[PDB]
Coordinates of C-alpha atoms in Angstrom, one line a residue:
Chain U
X62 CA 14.9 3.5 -7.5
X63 CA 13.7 5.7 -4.6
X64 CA 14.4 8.9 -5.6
X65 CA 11.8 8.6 -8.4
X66 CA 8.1 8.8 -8.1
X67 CA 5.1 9.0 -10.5
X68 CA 1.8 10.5 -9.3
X69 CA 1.1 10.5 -5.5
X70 CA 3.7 9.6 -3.9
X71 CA 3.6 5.2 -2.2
X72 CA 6.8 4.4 -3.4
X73 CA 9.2 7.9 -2.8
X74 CA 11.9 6.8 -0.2
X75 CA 14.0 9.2 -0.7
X76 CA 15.6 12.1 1.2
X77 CA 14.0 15.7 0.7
X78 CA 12.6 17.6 4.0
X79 CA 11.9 21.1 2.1
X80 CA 8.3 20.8 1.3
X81 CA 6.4 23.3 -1.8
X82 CA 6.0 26.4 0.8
X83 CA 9.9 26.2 2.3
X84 CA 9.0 24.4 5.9
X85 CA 10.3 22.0 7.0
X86 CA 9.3 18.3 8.4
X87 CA 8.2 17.0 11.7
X88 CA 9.9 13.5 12.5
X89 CA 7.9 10.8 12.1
X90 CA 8.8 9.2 15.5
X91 CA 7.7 12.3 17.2
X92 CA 4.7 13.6 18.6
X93 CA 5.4 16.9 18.8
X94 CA 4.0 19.9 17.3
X95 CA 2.0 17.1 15.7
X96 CA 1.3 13.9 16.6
X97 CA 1.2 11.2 13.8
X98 CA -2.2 10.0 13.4
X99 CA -0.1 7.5 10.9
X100 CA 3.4 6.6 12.0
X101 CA 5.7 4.2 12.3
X102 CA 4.7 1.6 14.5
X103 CA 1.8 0.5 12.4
X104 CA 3.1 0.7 8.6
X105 CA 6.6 -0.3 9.2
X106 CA 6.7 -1.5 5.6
X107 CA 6.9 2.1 4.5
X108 CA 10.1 3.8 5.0
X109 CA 9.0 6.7 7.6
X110 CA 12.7 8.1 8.9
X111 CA 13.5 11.8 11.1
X112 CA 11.4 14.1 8.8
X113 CA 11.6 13.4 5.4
X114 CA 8.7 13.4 3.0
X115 CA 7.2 10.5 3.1
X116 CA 3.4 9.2 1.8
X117 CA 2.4 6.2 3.3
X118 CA -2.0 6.4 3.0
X119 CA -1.6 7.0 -0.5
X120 CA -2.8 10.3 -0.5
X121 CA -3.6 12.3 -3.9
X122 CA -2.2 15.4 -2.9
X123 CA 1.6 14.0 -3.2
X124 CA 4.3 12.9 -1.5
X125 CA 4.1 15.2 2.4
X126 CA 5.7 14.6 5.8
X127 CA 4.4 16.1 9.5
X128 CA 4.6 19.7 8.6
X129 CA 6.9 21.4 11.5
X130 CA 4.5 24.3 11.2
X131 CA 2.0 24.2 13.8
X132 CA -0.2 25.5 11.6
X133 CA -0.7 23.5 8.9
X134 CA -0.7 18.9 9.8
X135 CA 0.7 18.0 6.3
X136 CA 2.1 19.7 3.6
X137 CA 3.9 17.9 0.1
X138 CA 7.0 17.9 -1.1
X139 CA 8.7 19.0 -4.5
X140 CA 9.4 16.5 -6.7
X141 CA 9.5 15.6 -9.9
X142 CA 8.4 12.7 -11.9
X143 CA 10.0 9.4 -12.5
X144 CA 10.1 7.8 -15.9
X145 CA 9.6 11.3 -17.4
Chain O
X4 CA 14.0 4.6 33.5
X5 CA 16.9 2.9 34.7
X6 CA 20.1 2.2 32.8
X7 CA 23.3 0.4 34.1
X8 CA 26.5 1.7 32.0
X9 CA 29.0 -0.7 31.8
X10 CA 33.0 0.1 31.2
X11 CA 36.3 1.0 32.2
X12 CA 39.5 2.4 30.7
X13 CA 41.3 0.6 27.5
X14 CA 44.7 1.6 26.4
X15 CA 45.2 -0.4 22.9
X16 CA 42.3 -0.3 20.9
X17 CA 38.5 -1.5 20.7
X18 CA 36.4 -1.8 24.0
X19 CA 33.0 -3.4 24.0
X20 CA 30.4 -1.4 26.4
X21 CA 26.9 -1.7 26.7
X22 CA 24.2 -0.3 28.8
X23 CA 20.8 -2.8 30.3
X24 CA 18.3 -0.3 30.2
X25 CA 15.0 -1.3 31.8
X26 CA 11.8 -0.3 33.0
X27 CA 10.1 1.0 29.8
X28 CA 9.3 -1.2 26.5
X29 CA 11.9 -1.0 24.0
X30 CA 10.0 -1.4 21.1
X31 CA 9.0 2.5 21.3
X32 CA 11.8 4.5 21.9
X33 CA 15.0 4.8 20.2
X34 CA 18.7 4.7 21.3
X35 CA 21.2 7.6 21.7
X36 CA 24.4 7.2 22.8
X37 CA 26.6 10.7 23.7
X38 CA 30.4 10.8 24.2
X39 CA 31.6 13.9 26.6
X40 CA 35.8 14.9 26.0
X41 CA 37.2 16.2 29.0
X42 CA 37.9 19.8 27.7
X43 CA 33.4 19.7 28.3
X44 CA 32.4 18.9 24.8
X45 CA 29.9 16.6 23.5
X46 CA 29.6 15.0 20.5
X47 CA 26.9 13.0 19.7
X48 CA 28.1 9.1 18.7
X49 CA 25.7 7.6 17.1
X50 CA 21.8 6.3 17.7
X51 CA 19.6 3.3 16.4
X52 CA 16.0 3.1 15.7
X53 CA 13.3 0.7 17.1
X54 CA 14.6 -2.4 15.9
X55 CA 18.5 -2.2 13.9
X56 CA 16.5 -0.8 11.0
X57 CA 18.5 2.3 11.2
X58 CA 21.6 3.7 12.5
X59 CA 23.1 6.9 12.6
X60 CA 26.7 8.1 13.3
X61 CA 29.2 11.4 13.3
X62 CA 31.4 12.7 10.5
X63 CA 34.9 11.2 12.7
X64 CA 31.9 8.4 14.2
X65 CA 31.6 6.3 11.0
X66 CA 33.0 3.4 10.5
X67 CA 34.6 3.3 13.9
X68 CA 31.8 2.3 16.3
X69 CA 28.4 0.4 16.0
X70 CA 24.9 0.8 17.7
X71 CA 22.8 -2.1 18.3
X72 CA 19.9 -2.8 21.0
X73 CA 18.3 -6.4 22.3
X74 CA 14.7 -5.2 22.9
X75 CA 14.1 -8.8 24.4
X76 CA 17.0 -8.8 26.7
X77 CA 16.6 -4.6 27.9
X78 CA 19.9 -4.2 27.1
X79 CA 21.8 -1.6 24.7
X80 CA 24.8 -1.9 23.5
X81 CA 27.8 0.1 21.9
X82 CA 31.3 -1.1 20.6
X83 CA 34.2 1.1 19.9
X84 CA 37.0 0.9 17.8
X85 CA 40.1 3.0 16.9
X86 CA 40.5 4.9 19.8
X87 CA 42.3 7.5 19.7
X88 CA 44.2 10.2 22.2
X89 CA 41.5 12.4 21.4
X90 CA 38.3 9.8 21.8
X91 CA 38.6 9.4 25.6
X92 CA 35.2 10.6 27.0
X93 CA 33.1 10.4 29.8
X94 CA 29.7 8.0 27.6
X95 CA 26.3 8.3 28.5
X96 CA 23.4 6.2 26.6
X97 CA 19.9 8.0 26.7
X98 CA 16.9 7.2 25.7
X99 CA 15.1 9.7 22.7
X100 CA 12.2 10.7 24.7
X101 CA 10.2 14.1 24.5
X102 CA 10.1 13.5 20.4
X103 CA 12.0 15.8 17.9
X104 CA 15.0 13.5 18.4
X105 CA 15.5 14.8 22.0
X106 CA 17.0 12.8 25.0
X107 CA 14.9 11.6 27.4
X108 CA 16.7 9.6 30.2
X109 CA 20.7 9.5 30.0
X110 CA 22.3 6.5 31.7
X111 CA 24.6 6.1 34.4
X112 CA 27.7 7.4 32.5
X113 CA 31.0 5.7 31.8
X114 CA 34.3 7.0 32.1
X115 CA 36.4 5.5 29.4
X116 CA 40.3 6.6 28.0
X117 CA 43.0 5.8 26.3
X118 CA 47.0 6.3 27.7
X119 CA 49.8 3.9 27.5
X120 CA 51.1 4.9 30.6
X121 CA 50.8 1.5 32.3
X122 CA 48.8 1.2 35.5
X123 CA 50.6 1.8 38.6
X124 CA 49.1 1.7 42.3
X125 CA 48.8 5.6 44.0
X126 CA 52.4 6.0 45.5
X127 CA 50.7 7.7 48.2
X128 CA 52.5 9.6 50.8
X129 CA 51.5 11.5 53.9
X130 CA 51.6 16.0 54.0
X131 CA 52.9 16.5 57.3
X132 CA 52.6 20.2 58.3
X133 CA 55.7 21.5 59.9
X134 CA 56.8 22.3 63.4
X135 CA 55.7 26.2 63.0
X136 CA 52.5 25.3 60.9
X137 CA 50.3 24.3 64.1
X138 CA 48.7 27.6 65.0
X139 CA 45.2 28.9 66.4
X140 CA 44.1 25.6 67.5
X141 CA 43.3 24.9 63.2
X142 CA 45.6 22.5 61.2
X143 CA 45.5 21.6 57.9
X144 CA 47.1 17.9 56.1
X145 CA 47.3 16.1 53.0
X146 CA 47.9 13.1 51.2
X147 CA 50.5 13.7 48.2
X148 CA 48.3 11.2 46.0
X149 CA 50.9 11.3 43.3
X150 CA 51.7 8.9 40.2
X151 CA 48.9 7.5 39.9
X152 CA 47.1 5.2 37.0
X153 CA 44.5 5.5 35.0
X154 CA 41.9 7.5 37.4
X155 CA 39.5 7.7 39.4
X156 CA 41.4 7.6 43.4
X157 CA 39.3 7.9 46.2
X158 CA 40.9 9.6 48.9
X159 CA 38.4 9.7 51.9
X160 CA 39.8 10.5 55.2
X161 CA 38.6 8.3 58.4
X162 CA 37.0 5.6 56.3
X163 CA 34.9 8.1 55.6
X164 CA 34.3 9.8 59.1
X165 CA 36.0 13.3 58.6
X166 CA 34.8 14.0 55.1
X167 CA 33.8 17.4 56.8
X168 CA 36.7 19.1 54.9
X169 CA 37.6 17.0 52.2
X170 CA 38.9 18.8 49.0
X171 CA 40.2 16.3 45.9
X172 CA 41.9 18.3 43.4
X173 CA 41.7 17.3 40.0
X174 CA 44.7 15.5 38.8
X175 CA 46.7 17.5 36.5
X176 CA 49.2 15.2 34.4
X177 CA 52.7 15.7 34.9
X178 CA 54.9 13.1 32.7
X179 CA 51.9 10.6 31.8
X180 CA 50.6 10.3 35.5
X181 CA 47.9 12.2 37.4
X182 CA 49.0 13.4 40.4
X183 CA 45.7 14.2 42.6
X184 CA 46.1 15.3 46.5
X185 CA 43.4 15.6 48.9
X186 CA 43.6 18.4 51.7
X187 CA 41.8 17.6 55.2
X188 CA 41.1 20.9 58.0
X189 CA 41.1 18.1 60.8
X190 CA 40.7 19.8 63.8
X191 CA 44.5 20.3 66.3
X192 CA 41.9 18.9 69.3
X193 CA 42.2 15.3 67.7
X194 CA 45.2 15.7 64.8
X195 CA 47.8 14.2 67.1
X196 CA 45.6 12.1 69.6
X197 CA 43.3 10.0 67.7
X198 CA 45.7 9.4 64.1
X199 CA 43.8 10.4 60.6
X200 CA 44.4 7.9 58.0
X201 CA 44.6 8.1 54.4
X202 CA 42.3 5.6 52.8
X203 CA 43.4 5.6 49.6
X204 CA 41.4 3.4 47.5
X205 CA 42.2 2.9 43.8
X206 CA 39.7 0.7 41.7
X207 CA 42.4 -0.1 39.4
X208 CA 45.0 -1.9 41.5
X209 CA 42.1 -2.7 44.1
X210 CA 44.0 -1.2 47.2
X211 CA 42.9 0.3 50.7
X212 CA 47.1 1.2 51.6
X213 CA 45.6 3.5 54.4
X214 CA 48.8 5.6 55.9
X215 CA 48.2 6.9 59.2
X216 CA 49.9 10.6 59.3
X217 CA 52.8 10.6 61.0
X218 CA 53.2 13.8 63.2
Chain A
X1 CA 21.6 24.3 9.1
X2 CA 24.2 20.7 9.4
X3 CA 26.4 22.4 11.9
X4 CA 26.3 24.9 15.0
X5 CA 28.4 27.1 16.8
X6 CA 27.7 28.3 20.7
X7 CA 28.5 31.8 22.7
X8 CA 30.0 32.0 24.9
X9 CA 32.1 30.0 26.7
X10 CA 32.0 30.4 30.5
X11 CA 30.0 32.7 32.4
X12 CA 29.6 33.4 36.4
X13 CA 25.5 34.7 37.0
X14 CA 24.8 35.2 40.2
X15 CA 21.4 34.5 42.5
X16 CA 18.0 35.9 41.1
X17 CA 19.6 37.3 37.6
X18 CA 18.5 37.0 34.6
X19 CA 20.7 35.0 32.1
X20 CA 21.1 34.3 28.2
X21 CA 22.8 32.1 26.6
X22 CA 23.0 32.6 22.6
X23 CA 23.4 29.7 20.0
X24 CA 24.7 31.4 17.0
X25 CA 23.6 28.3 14.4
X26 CA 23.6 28.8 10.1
X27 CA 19.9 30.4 9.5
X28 CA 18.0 27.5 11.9
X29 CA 16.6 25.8 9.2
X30 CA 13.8 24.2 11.4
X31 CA 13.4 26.8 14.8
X32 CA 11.7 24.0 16.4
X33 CA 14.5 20.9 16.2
X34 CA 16.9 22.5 18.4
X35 CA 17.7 21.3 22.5
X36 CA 19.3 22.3 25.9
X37 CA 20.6 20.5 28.2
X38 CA 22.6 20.6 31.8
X39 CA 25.7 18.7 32.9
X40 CA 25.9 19.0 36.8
X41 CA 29.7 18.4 38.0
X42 CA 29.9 14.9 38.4
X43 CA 26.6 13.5 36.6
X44 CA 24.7 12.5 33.7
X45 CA 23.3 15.2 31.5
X46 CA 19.7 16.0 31.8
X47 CA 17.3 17.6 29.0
X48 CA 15.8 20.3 30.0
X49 CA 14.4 22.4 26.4
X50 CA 13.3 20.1 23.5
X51 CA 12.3 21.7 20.6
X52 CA 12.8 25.6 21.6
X53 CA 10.3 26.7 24.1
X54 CA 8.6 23.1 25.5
X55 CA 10.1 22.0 28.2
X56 CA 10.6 18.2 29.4
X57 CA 9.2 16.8 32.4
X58 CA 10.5 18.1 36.1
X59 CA 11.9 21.4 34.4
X60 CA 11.8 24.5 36.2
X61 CA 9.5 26.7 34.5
X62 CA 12.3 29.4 34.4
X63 CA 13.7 27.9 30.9
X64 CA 12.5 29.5 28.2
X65 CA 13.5 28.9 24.5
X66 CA 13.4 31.6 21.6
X67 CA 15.3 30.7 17.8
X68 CA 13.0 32.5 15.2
X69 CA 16.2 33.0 13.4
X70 CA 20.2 31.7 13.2
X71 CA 20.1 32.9 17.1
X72 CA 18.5 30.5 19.5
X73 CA 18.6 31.8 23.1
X74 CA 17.8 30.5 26.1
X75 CA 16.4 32.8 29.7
X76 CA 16.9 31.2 33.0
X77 CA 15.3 33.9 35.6
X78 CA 15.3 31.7 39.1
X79 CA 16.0 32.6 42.7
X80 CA 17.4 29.0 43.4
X81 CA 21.2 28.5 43.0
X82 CA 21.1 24.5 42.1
X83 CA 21.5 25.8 38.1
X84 CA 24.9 26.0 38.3
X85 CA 25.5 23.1 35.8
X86 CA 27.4 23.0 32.1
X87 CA 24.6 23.6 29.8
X88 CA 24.9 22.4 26.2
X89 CA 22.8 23.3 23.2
X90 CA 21.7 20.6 21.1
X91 CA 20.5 21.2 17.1
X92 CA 18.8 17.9 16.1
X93 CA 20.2 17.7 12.3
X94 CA 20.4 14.3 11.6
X95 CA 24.0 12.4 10.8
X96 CA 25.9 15.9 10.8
X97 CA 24.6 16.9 14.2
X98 CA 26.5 18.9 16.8
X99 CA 26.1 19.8 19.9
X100 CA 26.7 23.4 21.6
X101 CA 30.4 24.2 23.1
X102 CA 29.2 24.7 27.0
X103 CA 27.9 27.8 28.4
X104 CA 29.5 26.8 31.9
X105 CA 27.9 28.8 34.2
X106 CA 29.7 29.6 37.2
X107 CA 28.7 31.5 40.3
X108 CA 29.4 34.6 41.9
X109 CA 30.3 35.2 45.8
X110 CA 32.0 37.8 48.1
X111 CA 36.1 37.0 47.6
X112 CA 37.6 35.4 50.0
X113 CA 41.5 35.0 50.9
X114 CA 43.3 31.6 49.9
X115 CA 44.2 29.4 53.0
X116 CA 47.6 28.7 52.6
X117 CA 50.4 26.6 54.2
X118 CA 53.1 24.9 52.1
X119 CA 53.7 21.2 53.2
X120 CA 57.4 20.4 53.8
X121 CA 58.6 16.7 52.1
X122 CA 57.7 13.5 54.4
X123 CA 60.4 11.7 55.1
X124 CA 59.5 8.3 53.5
X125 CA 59.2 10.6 50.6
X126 CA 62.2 11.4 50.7
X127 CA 63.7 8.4 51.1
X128 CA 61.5 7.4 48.3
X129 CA 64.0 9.3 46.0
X130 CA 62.4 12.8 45.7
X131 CA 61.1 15.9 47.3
X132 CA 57.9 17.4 46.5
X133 CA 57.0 21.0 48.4
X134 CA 53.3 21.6 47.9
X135 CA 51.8 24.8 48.6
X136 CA 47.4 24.1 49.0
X137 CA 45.2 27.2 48.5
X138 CA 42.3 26.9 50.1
X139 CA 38.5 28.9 50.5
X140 CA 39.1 31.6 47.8
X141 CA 36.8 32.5 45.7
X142 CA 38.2 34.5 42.5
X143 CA 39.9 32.0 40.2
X144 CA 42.4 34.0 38.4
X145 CA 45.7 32.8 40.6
X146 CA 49.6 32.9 39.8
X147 CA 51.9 31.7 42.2
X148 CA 55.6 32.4 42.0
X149 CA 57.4 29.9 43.4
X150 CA 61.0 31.2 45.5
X151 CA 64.0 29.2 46.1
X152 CA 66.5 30.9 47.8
X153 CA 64.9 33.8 46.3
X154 CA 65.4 32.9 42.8
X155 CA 62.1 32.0 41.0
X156 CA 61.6 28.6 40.1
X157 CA 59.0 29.0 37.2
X158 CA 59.8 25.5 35.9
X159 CA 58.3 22.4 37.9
X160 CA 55.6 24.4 38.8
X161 CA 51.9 22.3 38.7
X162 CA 48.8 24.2 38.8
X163 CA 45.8 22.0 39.8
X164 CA 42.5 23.7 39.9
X165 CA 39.2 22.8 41.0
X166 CA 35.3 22.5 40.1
X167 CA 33.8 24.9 42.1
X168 CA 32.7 23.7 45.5
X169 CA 29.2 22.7 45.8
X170 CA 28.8 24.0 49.2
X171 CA 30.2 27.1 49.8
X172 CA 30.7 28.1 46.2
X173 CA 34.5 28.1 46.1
X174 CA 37.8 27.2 44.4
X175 CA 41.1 25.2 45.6
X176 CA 44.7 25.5 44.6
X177 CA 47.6 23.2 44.5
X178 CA 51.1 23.8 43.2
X179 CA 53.9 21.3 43.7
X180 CA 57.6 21.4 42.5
X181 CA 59.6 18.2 41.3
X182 CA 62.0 18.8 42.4
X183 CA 64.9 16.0 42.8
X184 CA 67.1 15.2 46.2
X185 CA 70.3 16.9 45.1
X186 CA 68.9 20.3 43.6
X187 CA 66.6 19.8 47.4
X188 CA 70.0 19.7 49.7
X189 CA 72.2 22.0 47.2
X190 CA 69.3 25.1 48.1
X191 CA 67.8 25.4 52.2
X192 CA 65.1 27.9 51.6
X193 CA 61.5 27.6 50.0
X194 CA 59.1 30.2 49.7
X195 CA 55.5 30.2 48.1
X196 CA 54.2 33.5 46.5
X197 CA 50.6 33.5 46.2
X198 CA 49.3 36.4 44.1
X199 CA 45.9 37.0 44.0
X200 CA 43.6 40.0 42.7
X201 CA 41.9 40.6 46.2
X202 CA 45.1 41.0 48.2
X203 CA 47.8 43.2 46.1
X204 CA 50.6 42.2 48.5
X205 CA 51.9 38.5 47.6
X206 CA 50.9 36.1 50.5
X207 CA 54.1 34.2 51.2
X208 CA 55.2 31.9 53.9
X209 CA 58.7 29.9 54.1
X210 CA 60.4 26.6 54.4
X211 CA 63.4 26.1 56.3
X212 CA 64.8 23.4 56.6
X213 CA 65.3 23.6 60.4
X214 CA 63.3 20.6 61.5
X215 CA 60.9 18.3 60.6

């Protein structure tokens, strides 16, 4: 039941890191390149685990983790849609 | 900051170990524990999250041990199981630290190993030199530290006055017993005047048997 | 990517030169989740590189961490000599994660002659039941060393143990130990012992004898 998602992505607990432009996640118990302005120590409901794609402020963008680029804070995820 | 590292050698199967790390909060930081064979090789056993939410292991780690921390009682934990020739290791718990699953503060470290040798006290027997070996003024003698069990010996000479020119040699197993030796450069002005003993002291057995060297 | 492989095993720098140390790892999937660390001889391992070039806290600022790339190298140019320590690199990949094989680095000094004398058996050894000639090497530097061991001029290439050593913390050196075990009979069927140390500085064997003359 987490591996499927519909729209932006509240519910995806699942496992991908490789986001839509190939880079890769920054862990979500880690500060560095970026530090979580949202992490998880104050939505623990929300499954937020190394550095895979989670959304947890409901964002309409999609499902994104702490890009590891510098460059860019938060990128999403590929995905596709649950339920067809 | 500070961790203690608790442990000692097992022979037949699980050992229970545990680490009381204190000094920072433990609701912040995760838990890594590290194993280190003695052929210098590390491979990472384990690590839990903030609370037992999550816990991690190797490929040969699962299903064999088990991390879990008591954030009210600053201590961390760690039990073994099924192990093997090959699991003996030198342990260290650390703290994550520095982000990007790195490790911030390692603990004390634990030697732990499995051999079914038995434990035996350090038969320990003095190195005389011979009659022709005393020349220049500049002697050398030993302590034949030999069949030994399980490791560490401390072999300090004069209760630890003349560690001047101490050497341990690393045991090298010969049938299922480390052999150490030590090797002293006590000086001929005091060799046969004031006697060098050979603390010996083996944590195992719990023994001082200091042999004063017979010239 | 999952797993990581390390070159090269050991290396001997010496003061004020620059060193590498490559970590050959499967296309580095994330150049920035991949650690260093050092294992002084006889401690706890301390990070010193999280997350390529960013050091930790207390690091000499002669680290530095590259990795754009299945190659992930580190560049240690220092004066001081307190680096010499096993340092491991460390690719944070999650359950499969591995750590490096040691890059051991060694030192480098002028070679020096082993100190040698061979230590006839004490006589409660003997009485013990055995006889065990041991032949310390001492304050040499190079560590390539094969002793011959000479009994009554036959070599005794059996019952030969080879214990090295770390390398000294002081003076930057090596010690040797090789013992025989031999039994009482084979010891009072011979009279002579000889130990051959060979080493590359010296291209004449060092030997000195054993006779049982007195003890």
């Amino acid at each position: 039941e987490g591996n499927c998602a519909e729209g932006l992505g509240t519910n995806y607990r699942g496992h991908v890191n490789i986001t839509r432009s190939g880079i890769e996640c920054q862990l979500w118990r880690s500060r560095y390149p970026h530090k979580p302005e949202i992490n998880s120590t104050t939505h623990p409901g929300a499954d937020l685990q190394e550095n895979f794609c989670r959304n947890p402020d409901s964002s309409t963008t999609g499902p994104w983790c702490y890009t590891t680029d510098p460059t860019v804070r938060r990128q999403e995820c590929s995905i596709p849609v649950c339920g067809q | 900051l500070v961790e203690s590292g608790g442990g000692l050698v097992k022979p037949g199967g699980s050992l229970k170990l545990s680490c009381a790390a204190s000094g920072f909060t433990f609701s912040s930081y995760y838990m890594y524990w590290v194993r280190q064979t003695p052929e210098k090789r590390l491979e990472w056993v384990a690590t839990i999250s903030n609370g037992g939410i999550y816990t991690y292991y190797l490929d040969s780690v699962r299903g064999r041990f088990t991390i879990s921390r008591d954030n009210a009682k600053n201590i961390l934990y760690l039990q073994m199981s099924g192990l093997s020739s090959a699991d003996s290791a030198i342990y260290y718990c650390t703290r994550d630290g520095e982000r990007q699953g790195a490790m911030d503060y390692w603990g004390q470290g634990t030697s732990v190993t499995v051999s079914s040798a038995k434990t035996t006290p350090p038969s320990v027997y003095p190195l005389a030199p011979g009659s022709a070996a005393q020349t220049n003024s500049m002697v050398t003698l030993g302590c034949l530290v030999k069949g030994y069990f399980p490791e560490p010996v401390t072999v300090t000479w004069n209760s630890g006055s003349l560690s001047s020119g101490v050497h341990t040699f690393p045991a090298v197993l010969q049938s299922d017993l480390y052999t150490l030796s030590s090797s002293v450069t006590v000086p001929s002005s005091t060799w046969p005047s004031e006697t060098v003993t050979c603390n010996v002291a083996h944590p195992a057995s719990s023994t001082k048997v200091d042999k004063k060297i017979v010239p | 990517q999952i797993v990581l492989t390390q070159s090269p095993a050991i290396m001997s720098v010496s003061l004020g030169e620059r060193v590498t140390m490559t970590c050959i790892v499967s296309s580095s999937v994330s150049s920035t989740y991949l650690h260093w660390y050092q294992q002084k001889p006889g401690s706890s391992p301390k990070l010193w590189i999280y997350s390529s070039s960013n050091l930790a806290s207390g690091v000499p600022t002669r680290f530095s961490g590259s990795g754009s790339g299945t190659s992930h190298s580190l560049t240690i140019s220092s004066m001081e000599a307190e680096d010499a320590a096993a340092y491991y690199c460390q690719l944070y990949r999650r359950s499969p994660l591995t750590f490096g094989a040691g890059t051991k680095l060694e030192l480098k000094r002028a070679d020096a002659a082993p100190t040698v004398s061979i230590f006839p058996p004490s006589s409660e050894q003997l009485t013990s039941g055995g006889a065990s000639v041991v032949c310390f090497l001492n304050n040499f530097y190079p560590k390539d060393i094969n002793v011959k061991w000479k009994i009554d001029g036959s070599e005794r290439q059996n019952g030969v143990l080879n214990s090295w050593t770390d390398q000294d913390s002081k003076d930057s050196t090596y010690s040797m130990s090789s013992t025989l075990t031999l039994t009482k009979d084979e010891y009072e069927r011979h009279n002579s012992y000889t130990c051959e140390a060979t080493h590359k500085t010296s291209t004449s064997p060092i030997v000195k004898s054993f006779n049982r003359n007195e003890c």
